[PDB]
Amino acid sequence: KAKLFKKIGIGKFLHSAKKF
Hints:
This is Magainin-2. The chain is mainly alpha-helical. The chain has one helix and no strands. It starts with 11 loop residues before the first helix and ends with a helix.
């Protein structure tokens, strides 16, 4: 799952932010 790009703990923010 988390074994492709190099950002998993720094992309969840900008993601959750635009999520709600």
